[PDB]
Amino acid sequence: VNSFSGYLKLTDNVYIKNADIVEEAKKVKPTVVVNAANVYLKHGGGVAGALNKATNNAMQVESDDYIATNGPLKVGGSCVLSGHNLAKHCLHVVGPNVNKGEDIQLLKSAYENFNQHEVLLAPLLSAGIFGADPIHSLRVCVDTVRTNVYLAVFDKNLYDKLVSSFL
Ligand SMILES: c1nc(N2CCCCCOCC2)c2cc[nH]c2n1
């Protein structure tokens, strides 16, 4: 039993809910919240800027120190950093930004990072500014992640479309 409430069960391991991932993290304080990161961990907008804003910029301060030591992530890669006031840990995962020419095949590699964590609260990857179509992202998620993932999807029109179109 875990603390996640109001989710629709899609599969044995994948759950979905119309809720801001920021709002949800504050309420649940999960072990792991996933950030929709870029390779520079520059949290300017969307999931990352909203998560970072909710940490009063402490996520960005920690992230800048990480990059100064380690250099950029890979597209499809991840790192584990603090969850600050939102979660124990934040798994920063870089999905394929299609508007920068980043191979559509890399979304599966991105979701494979989730398998290193038994339970996660997560954004659909490569939605919004990444230039990808969310129905595809949910399919790859379901076909790739084997651990227990709670997808906070903050677009009802999109939530309802994802549910209604789910095979
Ligand atoms: C969950 N998913 C989020 N997505 C879903 C909406 C599609 C993306 C639009 O760019 C944010 C993307 C957000 C954003 C702020 N909070 C969130 N929580």
Swiss-Prot record:
UniProt topology in membrane: Multi-pass membrane protein
Domain of life of the native organism: Viruses
Protein name: Papain-like protease nsp3
Catalytic activities: Thiol-dependent hydrolysis of ester, thioester, amide, peptide and isopeptide bonds formed by the C-terminal Gly of ubiquitin (a 76-residue protein attached to proteins as an intracellular targeting signal)
Task of the protein: Responsible for the cleavages located at the N-terminus of the replicase polyprotein. Participates together with nsp4 in the assembly of virally-induced cytoplasmic double-membrane vesicles necessary for viral replication. Antagonizes innate immune induction of type I interferon by blocking the phosphorylation, dimerization and subsequent nuclear translocation of host IRF3. Also prevents host NF-kappa-B signaling. In addition, PL-PRO possesses a deubiquitinating/deISGylating activity and processes both 'Lys-48'- and 'Lys-63'-linked polyubiquitin chains from cellular substrates.
Every Macro domain range: 1-167
Subcellular location: Host endoplasmic reticulum membrane
Subunit text: May form homohexamers. Interacts with N protein.
Outcome of swapping T31A: In strain: Mu/B.1.621
Residues represented out of the complete protein: 1025 to 1191 of 7096
Activity regulation field: Inhibited in vitro by GRL-0617.
Taxonomic lineage: Viruses, Riboviria, Orthornavirae, Pisuviricota, Pisoniviricetes
